[PDB]
Design a protein around this nucleic acid. Structure first.
Ligand SMILES: Nc1c(C(=O)NCc2ccc(F)cc2F)c(=O)n(O)c2ncc(CCCCCO)cc12
Ligand SMILES: Nc1c(C(=O)NCc2ccc(F)cc2F)c(=O)n(O)c2ncc(CCCCCO)cc12
Ligand SMILES: [Mg+2]
Ligand SMILES: [Mg+2]
Ligand SMILES: [Mg+2]
Ligand SMILES: [Mg+2]
Ligand SMILES: [Zn+2]
Ligand SMILES: [Zn+2]
Ligand SMILES: [Zn+2]
Ligand SMILES: [Zn+2]
Lengths: 259, 65, 47, 242, 259, 47, 65, 242
DNA sequence: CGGGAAAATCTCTAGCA
DNA sequence: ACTGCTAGAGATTTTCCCG
DNA sequence: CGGGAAAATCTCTAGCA
DNA sequence: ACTGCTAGAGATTTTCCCG
């Protein structure tokens, strides 16, 4: 068995065989075989099999510059809704990106901007523009396009829609604005059966209304809880949600008392 | 007060778990804070982070709710 | 404590091992030879 | 449900509340409340206003949502028809505009603007724009020094006037006001779609004569007959089309 | 309703809105909306969401030329097993491919060869070589790499293994042969827990043995069936498999009699 | 009888409609303007 | 004869359905022809095309079978 | 199972069949049959042979699998050590070679061939190659005209000698013979792995003394004690390691 | 019978130009 | 008339093994 | 209650440099 | 210390609607 481990290492240093081959050729149990493989530096070549989940708060947008017909289209998307804005800019430079971002901050209540590490978005001009508008910048991991998985997707969609109306407009900027119109107000689907624009209006209105209602309720409903004194959040017919020193927990009616 | 409790319980929340990449069904928003949202899905209370919940008042409420 | 192998930036060759500073749901931040890098978990094996 | 309908119609006969109030008070389906409102004889958000303003020798297009005060300005290089049509198409893509009320200028009546209006389905007409224009020029004069060019100054003034100037009744900024008005408009449109869908139905209950369908729940059906709203169990009334 | 259809078409010819938008804005039922969309030529832009299944008979191989370190590696794979052969060829021309394919036909019992539409495989030299060896050629769809989904995959694997032993060999051909060795005899897994070479030996031996046994059984077990006179294949305790004029069917014991 | 739209060869633009000659599990063979083509079903919409 | 029936029933078949892209478990080869293969999986008789079945005699049969 | 063990060991005491026959006759687990074979006192596939052959001024490496007759030839440019090591590494990657029996030539004893043998785990030694070489040259002389160069002729001769020349006992070609021999070798290796795994166990049954484990089924356990094979129910015998 | 350990199976992503 | 797949990594389910 | 129709939901691929 | 997603196409499940 120990001679098994010795021979297995002496062979893996040559062939680099996976744990099944070493467990089968040297009668090792799978644990020792995996421990042999996991200790080799060259046999670690494939990462995890998963996917993250991008920020989808109701106040974060995603920007990116795409290229179509030799022109540069700057595209931003409201992550939580899918309402996209787009504009054909003359050059993929910092000034145009800062101008478009200040426009977008004037139109809709943006609170965060998530971009790739393109020079357009990484510049001091978009940074000064974000500092003026109270916008928080959030760059993705370098060379990880999937981190902007929303906007890139919209890019595809946007381009496709241009491919349907490109012959209805002489120039390209007109076609891009028509594609924005079609994607926002003439293509329903999504979560609530809404179009994009209806969904973003609903998202923002619901954010405001829920903030107001929760503020009022928290102003009125003042109950200390014991289960250390936390804060009471919601108690209905079988459960109690408490907030214990920046840690929201949920308990049953048992193991909990209210004052 | 109970009127506003029931009002804030009328909104709908679509959320996602930590390793579940498909959007869960429309829950019932019970509480919405600065960083977390307490919902009730299929009569099970959950606490989802703010960065994983789309909170909409589905205006297809003109038939039910 | 831990070891992390990563594929950083358009370089198909893997590298490591590197210390694991903070593992968050979606991506990790690691320290390879006094270089603090951020890497998506799809491009990082943690032992 | 049965306890709420008579209460709501009696309350309306008392002091004629609105249908949203009845819906939020007695937990009624909005169609039933709309019908109760339409039972008494005694008982807009897409009207944008465009204009051009000269400043420092450059021309800015200003579009004011009349019902809210939300503003959209843009420095255009020349007061021509093409740029006006482009800006109007942008505004049509961004916000749900349904009618544009201009000032019969030399550019808003061009053929290109007319084409861009026929495409986006925008009706055209031919005094809130003056006060909002003066306010926007005031804010530009205030915040000019914080930028170098004029485009950035105009965009900063728009930002300030949309999300940093709270007034009116409840102190809501212009952005919150416009999103609330558009949410109300979406609610009205969805209710109208529901009414139009349910309108061309017919029901026969308990038998009895014809009646117009108002609501079709799980096992209950709320109908109207001779200006009287009734409820019946499902299997006691059969529905047909017309 | 009919005016609904008219207005819906007059609008879709402009905006090109999906069936949900036309069903929501004009009160059409989903069937009519889908019928409106499915009749527009520009709104048909995404095909099916599926994947085929490559030929995995025990007598079909897949060839492809990959490029590594500026050299050309010709790689063939037995589809049903995963046993790969590889050889560094001096140029991606027809003669080298024909020579390697004749080699592979001499070594293992190949009966079909599935390649992309590379000039190497499409040539008259590989065709004459396939005609001499009784090999049947089967080209994939042009510009559809997934049709060779096996070999391309192996390419990846092969390259990865070279990336583990490239520093154990001076030249490249030696490293490629070492990678073939490692992939065939020192990396278990697959379906039967075998390595590649063990699995291909099992595949071929089982093919031969099953052919022999089935030939003998068909020679002995001669029963006409009635359920039209078909041929009997297998009858066990609750079912009967018949072969009715080149159409294999399965029936229960009921609705079937044997002579 | 049928209609088939396809994306043939490294050309992102779609084309059609074309008659459906034979639909097999995995790919179809179609006839567009006397041109007989084979297309994987992932690149063909059939109506 | 029954000996050879049982012999040909000892082999194992891994197959795939028409739209199922994952390899089904090890069935029991009942009959193998020129273009089709009749197998029995979980006591259900199936007929899979020859181009969708890997037929191996798993030499991990030295413990069972 | 119990009815088969005594029958098989009595049959072996009768005329000493092989363990594969006992396994295929009484449906016994192969380990039990192997032990029954090892119960009587009275009761190779990786030996390749390489050589070089001159023809038309070019040198061809010929590797013959001794136990089957399957051949592998390859025209090499020069009878050097590097090309021999390359061909041997190819052959080691393709077929499960475990020993190479060469002819003590000037190239098969080089340091590069020795390295390629130490890497692939191939033992080296130092008369079937002559007859097979003459047969391969005969087939080359036959099929030479059907090709232009010599490489293609040699490969065609290899194809003919591997899959188109059936002889021997059952008329099986060389390819079928080698795949059958390698399948038998794989069976033997897997049985040996099973025996080696089960060997370092120990069992205590019904109590009783030590015993060596032979097979561990579902609820039955087949053990050996004092050269006598017995079967017991699982919960009547406990297993330990050693 | 029933809790852990362990083996087996399911899910899924990178890369194959 | 033709066609995505392979291997590893981690989560989840099923089996094993005594107590 | 129970068969079809219809709506809703699940699965999944292309493309986003 | 941060992160794949969107829409359509077809298969599959669940609801509806009278008989
Ligand atoms: N490479 C870029 C991609 C891209 O790779 N698309 C392929 C792709 C693959 C998968 C997927 F999900 C989406 C997806 F888009 C992109 O889309 N954008 O907008 C970029 N914008 C800017 C830069 C410059 C980076 C500077 C160097 C880093 O410091 C690169 C990119
Ligand atoms: N393009 C080729 C690819 C390829 O595209 N890989 C990317 C890819 C993507 C996805 C996937 F699953 C696999 C996969 F490999 C390839 O792999 N091979 O071997 C080729 N061999 C030869 C020709 C020349 C064709 C001549 C013009 C046609 O008449 C092209 C290719
Ligand atoms: Mg970018
Ligand atoms: Mg991009
Ligand atoms: Mg190729
Ligand atoms: Mg390739
Ligand atoms: Zn290793
Ligand atoms: Zn009234
Ligand atoms: Zn269309
Ligand atoms: Zn004996």
């Amino acid at each position: 068995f120990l001679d098994g481990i010795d021979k297995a290492q002496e062979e893996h240093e040559k062939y680099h065989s996976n744990w099944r081959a070493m467990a089968s050729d040297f009668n090792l149990p799978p644990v020792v075989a995996k421990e042999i493989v996991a200790s080799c530096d060259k046999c670690q070549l494939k990462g995890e099999a998963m996917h993250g989940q991008v920020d989808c708060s109701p106040g974060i947008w995603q920007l990116d510059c795409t290229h179509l017909e030799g022109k540069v289209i700057l595209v931003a998307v409201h992550v939580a809704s899918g309402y996209i804005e787009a504009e054909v800019i003359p050059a993929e430079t910092g000034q145009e990106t800062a101008y478009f971002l200040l426009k977008l901050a004037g139109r809709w209540p943006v609170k965060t901007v998530h971009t790739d590490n393109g020079s357009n978005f990484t510049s001091t001009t978009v940074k000064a523009a974000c500092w003026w508008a109270g916008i928080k910048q959030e760059f993705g991991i370098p060379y990880n396009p999937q981190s902007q998985g929303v906007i890139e997707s919209m890019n595809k969609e946007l381009k496709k829609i241009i491919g349907q109306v490109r012959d209805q407009a002489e120039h390209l900027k007109t076609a891009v604005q028509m594609a924005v119109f079609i994607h926002n107000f003439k293509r329903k689907g999504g979560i609530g059966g809404y179009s994009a624009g209806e969904r973003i209006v609903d998202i923002i209105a619901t954010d405001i209304q829920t903030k107001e209602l929760q503020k009022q309720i928290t102003k009125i409903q003042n109950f200390r809880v014991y289960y250390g004194p936390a804060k009471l959040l919601w108690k209905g017919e079988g459960a109690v949600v408490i907030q214990d020193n920046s840690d929201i927990k949920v308990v049953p009616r048992r193991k909990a008392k209210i004052i | 007060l109970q009127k506003q409790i029931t009002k804030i319980q009328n909104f709908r929340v679509y959320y996602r778990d930590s390793r579940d990449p498909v959007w869960k069904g429309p829950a019932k928003l019970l509480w919405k804070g600065e960083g977390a949202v307490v919902i009730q899905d299929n009569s099970d209370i959950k606490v989802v982070p703010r960065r994983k919940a789309k909170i909409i008042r589905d205006y297809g409420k003109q038939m039910a709710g | 404590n831990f070891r992390v192998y990563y594929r950083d930036s358009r370089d198909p060759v893997w590298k490591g091992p590197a210390k694991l500073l903070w593992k968050g749901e979606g991506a990790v931040v690691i320290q390879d030879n006094s270089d603090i890098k951020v890497v998506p978990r799809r491009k990082a094996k943690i032992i």
